[PDB]
Amino acid sequence: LPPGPLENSSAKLVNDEAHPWKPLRPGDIRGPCPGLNTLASHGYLPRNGVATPVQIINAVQEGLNFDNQAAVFATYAAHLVDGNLITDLLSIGRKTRLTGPDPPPPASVGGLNEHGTFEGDASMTRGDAFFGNNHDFNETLFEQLVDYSNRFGGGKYNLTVAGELRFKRIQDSIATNPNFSFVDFRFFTAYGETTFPANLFVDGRRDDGQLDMDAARSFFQFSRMPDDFFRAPSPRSGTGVEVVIQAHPMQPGRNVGKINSYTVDPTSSDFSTPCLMYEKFVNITVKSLYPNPTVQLRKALNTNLDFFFQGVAAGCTQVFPYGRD
Amino acid sequence: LPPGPLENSSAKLVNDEAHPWKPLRPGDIRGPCPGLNTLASHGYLPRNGVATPVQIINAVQEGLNFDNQAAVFATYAAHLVDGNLITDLLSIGRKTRLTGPDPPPPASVGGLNEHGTFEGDASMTRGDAFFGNNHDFNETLFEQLVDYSNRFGGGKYNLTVAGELRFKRIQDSIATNPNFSFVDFRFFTAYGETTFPANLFVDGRRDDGQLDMDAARSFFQFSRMPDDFFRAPSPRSGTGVEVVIQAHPMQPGRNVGKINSYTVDPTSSDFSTPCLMYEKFVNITVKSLYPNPTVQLRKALNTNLDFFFQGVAAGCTQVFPYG
Ligand SMILES: *[C@@H]1O[C@H](CO)[C@@H](O[C@@H]2O[C@H](CO)[C@@H](O[C@@H]3O[C@H](CO[C@H]4O[C@H](CO[C@H]5O[C@H](CO)[C@@H](O)[C@H](O)[C@@H]5O)[C@@H](O)[C@H](O[C@H]5O[C@H](CO)[C@@H](O)[C@H](O)[C@@H]5O)[C@@H]4O)[C@@H](O)[C@H](O[C@H]4O[C@H](CO)[C@@H](O)[C@H](O)[C@@H]4O[C@H]4O[C@H](CO)[C@@H](O)[C@H](O)[C@@H]4O)[C@@H]3O)[C@H](O)[C@H]2NC(C)=O)[C@H](O)[C@H]1NC(C)=O
Ligand SMILES: *[C@@H]1O[C@H](CO)[C@@H](O[C@@H]2O[C@H](CO)[C@@H](O[C@@H]3O[C@H](CO[C@H]4O[C@H](CO)[C@@H](O)[C@H](O)[C@@H]4O)[C@@H](O)[C@H](O[C@H]4O[C@H](CO)[C@@H](O)[C@H](O)[C@@H]4O[C@H]4O[C@H](CO)[C@@H](O)[C@H](O)[C@@H]4O)[C@@H]3O)[C@H](O)[C@H]2NC(C)=O)[C@H](O)[C@H]1NC(C)=O
Ligand SMILES: *[C@@H]1O[C@H](CO)[C@@H](O[C@@H]2O[C@H](CO)[C@@H](O[C@@H]3O[C@H](CO[C@H]4O[C@H](CO[C@H]5O[C@H](CO)[C@@H](O)[C@H](O)[C@@H]5O)[C@@H](O)[C@H](O)[C@@H]4O)[C@@H](O)[C@H](O)[C@@H]3O)[C@H](O)[C@H]2NC(C)=O)[C@H](O)[C@H]1NC(C)=O
Ligand code: HEM
Ligand code: HEM
Ligand SMILES: *[C@@H]1O[C@H](CO)[C@@H](O[C@@H]2O[C@H](CO)[C@@H](O[C@@H]3O[C@H](CO)[C@@H](O)[C@H](O)[C@@H]3O)[C@H](O)[C@H]2NC(C)=O)[C@H](O)[C@H]1NC(C)=O
Ligand SMILES: *[C@@H]1O[C@H](CO)[C@@H](O[C@@H]2O[C@H](CO)[C@@H](O)[C@H](O)[C@H]2NC(C)=O)[C@H](O)[C@H]1NC(C)=O
Ligand SMILES: *[C@@H]1O[C@H](CO)[C@@H](O[C@@H]2O[C@H](CO)[C@@H](O)[C@H](O)[C@H]2NC(C)=O)[C@H](O)[C@H]1NC(C)=O
Ligand SMILES: *[C@@H]1O[C@H](CO)[C@@H](O[C@@H]2O[C@H](CO)[C@@H](O)[C@H](O)[C@H]2NC(C)=O)[C@H](O)[C@H]1NC(C)=O
Ligand SMILES: *[C@@H]1O[C@H](CO)[C@@H](O[C@@H]2O[C@H](CO)[C@@H](O)[C@H](O)[C@H]2NC(C)=O)[C@H](O)[C@H]1NC(C)=O
Ligand SMILES: *[C@@H]1O[C@H](CO)[C@@H](O[C@@H]2O[C@H](CO)[C@@H](O)[C@H](O)[C@H]2NC(C)=O)[C@H](O)[C@H]1NC(C)=O
Ligand SMILES: *[C@@H]1O[C@H](CO)[C@@H](O)[C@H](O)[C@H]1NC(C)=O
Ligand SMILES: [Mg+2]
Ligand SMILES: [Mg+2]
């Protein structure tokens, strides 16, 4: 089973004795999530960056007070598209042989770096896949984050900044990336993630939604908590995401083979249709990766698909791409 | 000090031996909030409907698993504008001399029923104040809620139903209430509130976002928990509000002297500017109720303003009406 919520979810020192930062050994895997990167680099996750969904959920909860439903939702979503369902292993970065024997195509078990499954365009501190590297910290983008913190956050990162910067990264991609895609699951995650630094990288004794540019660079670039960093004083994730959505209302869509041809996708879900997004993710995205699984793979798919459904906070009705039972 | 978060926030029986439903005595106070109403009728709050901030915050958390920031934000906003800052008492309903000696005008201490401070138009199950009773359960509107739950919820109330019903109640008021006002604070809370029934009134052992009509009537009409009701399995309030907002985009505004004259207000806060909403609440709303507090009043104001600010989940810069 996925973990339950924390028993004691108060703020506490998480940059402590048993969870020191350490530099990367060769073979250590890091990817497009500064959240999971930091947990790994503090040993809340295995330090090589290869983990079970359960390990990942306990980590985000213990290390950072990510809420339970959000942790279940994101973990099992990633695992379903990016992880190996038999070994129950997911890489938080590049495709690796340490996740075990692969399933048939088109499932690719590419880990969190796999473009177009979880990872997607218009990341705040990462370049679009189309340009070549979709997971490494990018200094130009980060210093754009700083600018926007200066203009909009009086020098801090907060949900007002998130609003502006989220729109700016969208415009950037429309303008430069002929393969820009911003529909369905990526349309969804791209908004919440911009709340995460304000809600979770801010020291929990303060919990005031103003993230400083030191704490920011530390998380985004080095996967390192600040000294004496306390986690937030309660479980949360994308609280305030409506601030980011309403700052510059966008319709989901994509460039159509060239820059500046952003075209609305009338079949995409959006924020008014979360159950449609859940249903698409299950009955199209996951299903296309595993169209005709063997008996063993089917039972693993169904188990993980169960756990995924549990993390859908809107409720919705479970769908069953391989039948009930 | 405001209570902090529950120590143990898991689901548990809350309709219990310690907390039985009991019919109203005469002079028992109930108001426009089904949540506070139900806690008072179960003895989580004082049964007569008059309570401290600290009592209200413990109630909503213990009885229903309202989250600690949302409890502080809502509780100290209400008290600031509707409660007695000297006696530390707020009526969850009508103005009552039971909150103690009134401060001077233009402060009203009208309790939760006070139109235009916290209470406002386009409620799900309460009529707009213009029509003359802004607090009693209204059966025709609940019937619309039942209908919309059949149409969009498969028989149940859920976030998709909340999205359609919130827009329809807006349209209703624009079409019928020449005094419709839907800006600033009321614009913000009217959305979050339509998530509550699906997030909070749903038995905690399911937590599946689908509220049945038996349980909805219970809460909204009789301020009664279902038999064997468990509270939610974690602390929450307005999870999913973005769904309700995007279902039918609306700007803040009001009718101007007549029906079908909805006039957007570009000076209002909206969901993109929660710090401006906080600001305007403190600097215009509270300030105008207490333009010149005596030294004692001013002390109590600042103390409660501090607490209100703690509850502002977006963060924001604290603002100071009295320095
Ligand atoms: C939320 O609301 C609060 C109000 O509830 C906002 O705070 C208020 O901000 C306004 C506008 O900025 C300030 O107005 C300015 O006040 C100064 C003088 O202020 C001094 O005197 C005030 C009066 O004293 C009271 O009590 C005495 C008796 O003891 C009475 O006689 C008085 O009449 C008053 O009742 C006093 O209140 C002030 O104390 C407060 O502020 C100080 C900080 O300065 C704190 O230490 C205190 O603790 C307390 O908070 C203070 O001692 C005026 O001189 C200003 O006039 C200038 O600007 C005008 C336009 O705004 C212009 O018309 C004038 O001609 C003059 O313009 C000139 O000066 C400007 C620079 O000041 C130049 O920029 C300009 O070009 C030109 O050169 C001005 O009216 C209030 O003081 C302040 N009130 C409080 C209680 O703090 C708050 O800003 C709001 N928050 C947000 C985010 O909006
Ligand atoms: C429980 O809650 C409900 C809803 O809030 C409430 O019923 C509502 O009562 C109000 C107040 O009377 C009604 O408002 C009127 O609506 C009609 C429109 O007819 C509608 O019919 C259906 C509903 O059956 C609507 O859904 C549909 O959209 C139709 O439009 C308007 O014509 C009325 O306008 C008159 O009164 C206004 C307010 O005073 C004036 O501003 C306006 O100019 C009109 O005034 C004219 O008549 C006046 C006398 O009435 C007089 O001054 C002049 O002659 C003047 O020219 C009005 O806005 C609303 O429709 C009701 N909704 C329902 C029944 O679904 C219940 O009463 C409430 N229960 C309680 C409080 O106990
Ligand atoms: C709140 O609760 C409601 C209801 O449970 C949820 O609403 C559902 O929303 C989903 C979006 O994810 C809708 O799914 C979409 O359905 C499309 C088809 O629409 C029409 O056909 C449907 C098929 O009905 C079948 O089954 C019924 C009986 O079971 C038979 O009558 C029919 O013959 C069919 O066999 C109808 O149900 C529907 O009314 C339409 O006419 C489909 O093409 C899309 O791909 C997608 O799957 C679904 O339609 C909604 N169901 C209802 C009853 O409204 C909502 O998500 C919940 N919200 C939350 C937040 O929990
Ligand atoms: C629960 C397991 C989680 C998974 C599986 C996950 C996965 C991911 C993935 C795949 C991305 C890349 C999306 C893109 O293209 O930008 C991402 C981005 C992001 N993640 Fe996570 N994440 C998880 C938890 C967290 C946590 C706990 C945090 C911080 C508290 C976090 C913070 C962020 C941020 C801020 C980004 C955007 C990075 C940027 O745009 O520069 N994530 N995450
Ligand atoms: C924290 C203290 C609280 C205060 C001070 C408060 C206050 C109020 C007030 C004044 C209103 C009337 C607004 C209007 O509709 O005109 C309201 C409405 C409402 N409240 Fe609360 N409330 C609190 C907690 C809760 C809780 C814990 C719940 C649990 C679900 C809740 C559920 C609701 C709902 C569903 C409405 C909408 C009623 C309708 O539209 O018919 N409230 N509340
Ligand atoms: C980190 O992300 C930034 C943001 O995009 C990347 O900077 C961009 O780098 C590209 C090529 O390296 C620059 O493109 C060049 O621009 C000229 C026109 O000015 C064009 O004619 C050339 O053909 C070429 O495409 C682009 O200007 C530049 N953008 C900004 C805002 O600096 C950077 O490459 C990323 N770092 C990586 C991928 O390591
Ligand atoms: C829940 O955890 C919190 C934070 O860790 C506890 O409060 C602290 O407990 C630690 C013990 O490791 C003490 O060193 C601190 O002095 C406490 N901080 C305070 C009181 O601000 C709290 O005791 C825990 N609650 C329960 C019921 O175990
Ligand atoms: C999600 O996908 C599954 C599999 O495609 C759908 O189940 C199929 O539905 C068709 C049409 O009713 C049946 O003829 C097949 O036998 C079903 N295959 C099964 C059950 O393995 C399922 O209905 C989809 N769910 C939704 C809500 O669209
Ligand atoms: C937290 O609350 C519950 C009581 O509501 C405690 O355990 C629950 O209640 C009984 C007691 O064992 C169990 O049968 C239930 O399964 C428990 N509910 C759960 C686990 O959701 C629990 O022990 C309390 N405190 C701690 C620290 O767990
Ligand atoms: C609709 O709004 C108007 C105007 O805001 C209210 O008019 C008030 O009337 C009362 C007494 O009848 C006076 O105390 C106020 O001075 C008036 N205000 C203004 C600005 O003119 C009106 O009463 C509201 N209608 C109802 C039925 O509540
Ligand atoms: C982010 O921080 C900024 C600056 O501290 C806050 O923005 C200020 O908000 C006030 C009133 O809301 C306005 O003067 C400007 O919009 C801002 N000032 C400046 C200098 O930009 C903002 O409220 C913060 N947002 C959150 C959610 O904390
Ligand atoms: C982008 O899509 C185009 C057209 O579909 C195709 O050439 C290629 O697969 C993609 N290009 C890159 C650089 O990924
Ligand atoms: Mg990306
Ligand atoms: Mg009302």
Side-chain angles (χ1 to χ4, degrees), chain A:
Chain A
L1 286 191
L6 252 30
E7 264 156 348
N8 184 353
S9 75
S10 301
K12 47 175 266 223
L13 182 54
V14 288
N15 193 353
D16 56 22
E17 309 87 49
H19 300 103
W21 186 91
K22 310 187 154 171
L24 301 167
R25 322 157 296 193
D28 286 351
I29 290 167
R30 302 292 186 264
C33 181
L36 290 190
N37 287 347
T38 304
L39 293 163
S41 272
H42 283 263
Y44 283 93
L45 286 169
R47 290 177 186 268
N48 78 342
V50 173
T52 73
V54 160
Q55 273 168 325
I56 290 168
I57 288 157
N58 287 313
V60 296
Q61 302 190 160
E62 300 278 348
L64 287 168
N65 236 340
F66 211 62
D67 82 89
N68 184 251
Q69 277 201 293
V72 166
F73 173 91
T75 300
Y76 286 108
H79 186 45
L80 283 165
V81 294
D82 285 339
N84 190 301
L85 268 16
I86 304 302
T87 62
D88 203 37
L89 289 177
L90 167 68
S91 154
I92 70 175
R94 55 171 170 88
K95 189 175 170 36
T96 168
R97 270 158 319 188
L98 311 186
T99 61
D102 275 352
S108 50
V109 190
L112 291 186
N113 288 13
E114 189 74 31
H115 173 64
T117 58
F118 207 121
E119 192 287 318
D121 300 336
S123 302
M124 284 178 288
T125 70
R126 261 67 185 174
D128 287 1
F130 176 88
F131 299 121
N133 179 319
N134 75 347
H135 56 282
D136 288 319
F137 175 89
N138 179 306
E139 176 72 30
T140 306
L141 293 178
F142 184 75
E143 299 187 8
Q144 172 168 254
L145 183 152
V146 181
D147 299 351
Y148 265 68
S149 292
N150 290 338
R151 290 166 58 193
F152 293 114
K156 281 20 196 281
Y157 185 93
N158 69 17
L159 293 177
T160 305
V161 189
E164 292 315 315
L165 167 61
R166 156 56 48 229
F167 186 61
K168 182 50 189 290
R169 299 289 301 114
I170 293 165
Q171 289 177 308
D172 286 353
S173 288
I174 297 178
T176 56
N177 175 359
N179 277 19
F180 187 38
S181 171
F182 204 61
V183 300
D184 299 312
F185 191 64
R186 174 70 187 156
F187 190 84
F188 179 79
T189 64
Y191 286 81
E193 287 163 3
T194 57
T195 73
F196 293 172
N199 292 340
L200 295 137
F201 289 166
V202 168
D203 182 290
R205 289 158 302 193
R206 207 177 345 117
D207 188 26
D208 65 351
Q210 322 293 312
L211 175 64
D212 71 68
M213 287 307 99
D214 249 274
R217 172 180 295 281
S218 191
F219 284 114
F220 285 109
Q221 171 169 31
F222 295 109
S223 318
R224 184 159 59 239
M225 307 168 161
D227 272 298
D228 189 46
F229 184 80
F230 276 51
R231 78 191 185 176
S234 66
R236 82 285 299 277
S237 58
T239 314
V241 68
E242 64 273 14
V243 180
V244 191
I245 292 161
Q246 292 309 132
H248 296 283
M250 284 281 319
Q251 287 178 268
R254 80 273 184 223
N255 276 336
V256 170
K258 66 121 168 301
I259 51 158
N260 303 111
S261 55
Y262 195 82
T263 301
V264 162
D265 179 3
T267 67
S268 176
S269 64
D270 60 41
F271 284 97
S272 73
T273 52
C275 307
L276 179 63
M277 193 244 78
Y278 155 70
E279 283 203 5
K280 298 193 85 198
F281 182 80
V282 172
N283 251 34
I284 300 187
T285 304
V286 172
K287 180 86 172 296
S288 304
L289 293 180
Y290 294 93
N292 195 38
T294 55
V295 168
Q296 194 178 354
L297 220 18
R298 205 197 68 105
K299 161 177 181 138
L301 286 156
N302 276 343
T303 290
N304 291 287
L305 277 168
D306 284 359
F307 298 155
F308 178 56
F309 175 70
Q310 285 162 25
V312 181
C316 304
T317 298
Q318 198 166 353
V319 313
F320 294 100
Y322 309 107
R324 273 157 224 249
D325 257 85

Side-chain angles (χ1 to χ4, degrees), chain B:
Chain B
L1 296 141
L6 269 14
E7 293 205 321
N8 182 348
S9 57
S10 36
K12 70 184 210 177
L13 179 65
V14 291
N15 186 352
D16 60 23
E17 187 152 309
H19 297 102
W21 187 79
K22 293 180 186 184
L24 302 174
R25 314 314 200 148
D28 272 343
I29 286 154
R30 294 307 178 268
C33 181
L36 309 180
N37 285 355
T38 289
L39 300 160
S41 285
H42 278 271
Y44 283 97
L45 283 172
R47 292 192 183 262
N48 79 312
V50 176
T52 70
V54 160
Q55 275 170 341
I56 291 160
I57 284 158
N58 278 311
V60 290
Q61 293 191 151
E62 284 285 338
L64 295 163
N65 232 339
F66 214 55
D67 73 273
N68 178 265
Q69 288 211 277
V72 171
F73 177 89
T75 290
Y76 292 104
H79 190 225
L80 279 167
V81 291
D82 288 337
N84 191 313
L85 291 331
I86 304 296
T87 61
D88 204 46
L89 288 169
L90 162 72
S91 159
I92 62 177
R94 61 165 197 273
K95 187 181 203 344
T96 183
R97 69 218 163 80
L98 314 169
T99 45
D102 268 341
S108 34
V109 181
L112 290 200
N113 288 189
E114 184 74 20
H115 180 60
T117 60
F118 202 126
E119 196 287 324
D121 293 336
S123 307
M124 285 175 298
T125 68
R126 266 63 184 172
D128 294 352
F130 181 76
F131 305 123
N133 184 321
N134 70 345
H135 50 100
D136 284 337
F137 176 89
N138 170 313
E139 166 66 42
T140 294
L141 293 176
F142 187 74
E143 183 60 53
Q144 172 166 253
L145 187 155
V146 177
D147 184 50
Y148 270 49
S149 294
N150 281 271
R151 294 155 62 161
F152 301 114
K156 276 83 157 101
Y157 185 95
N158 69 19
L159 295 183
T160 303
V161 180
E164 301 304 319
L165 190 63
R166 154 70 36 243
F167 177 58
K168 163 89 168 169
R169 290 300 288 121
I170 296 161
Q171 286 190 307
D172 278 355
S173 290
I174 295 182
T176 66
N177 178 356
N179 277 24
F180 187 35
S181 170
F182 206 63
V183 294
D184 294 309
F185 191 63
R186 175 48 187 168
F187 185 85
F188 165 92
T189 58
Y191 280 83
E193 284 162 8
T194 62
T195 75
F196 297 164
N199 290 349
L200 291 151
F201 284 169
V202 163
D203 186 278
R205 297 160 276 176
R206 264 185 300 116
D207 190 31
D208 64 355
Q210 320 300 304
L211 171 78
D212 77 65
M213 296 303 97
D214 188 308
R217 184 171 293 270
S218 214
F219 284 111
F220 277 101
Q221 180 166 30
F222 294 118
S223 327
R224 187 188 337 208
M225 300 172 186
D227 298 334
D228 194 49
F229 186 75
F230 278 44
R231 74 177 186 206
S234 59
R236 79 277 304 275
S237 42
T239 308
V241 77
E242 65 273 13
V243 179
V244 182
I245 291 160
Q246 274 311 307
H248 288 292
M250 270 307 298
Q251 289 313 104
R254 75 304 186 167
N255 277 338
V256 304
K258 67 191 198 222
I259 65 176
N260 303 114
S261 68
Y262 194 70
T263 301
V264 171
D265 183 2
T267 74
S268 181
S269 62
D270 53 49
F271 288 97
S272 69
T273 58
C275 296
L276 177 71
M277 183 266 289
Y278 156 76
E279 201 159 285
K280 295 189 60 172
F281 189 75
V282 169
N283 250 30
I284 298 168
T285 307
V286 171
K287 169 94 171 182
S288 92
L289 294 161
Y290 291 98
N292 245 98
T294 59
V295 174
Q296 174 73 167
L297 226 18
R298 160 167 194 298
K299 205 36 224 275
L301 285 159
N302 289 330
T303 289
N304 291 278
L305 285 161
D306 292 347
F307 296 157
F308 177 52
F309 177 80
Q310 281 163 29
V312 173
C316 297
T317 295
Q318 177 163 14
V319 165
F320 300 95
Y322 313 102

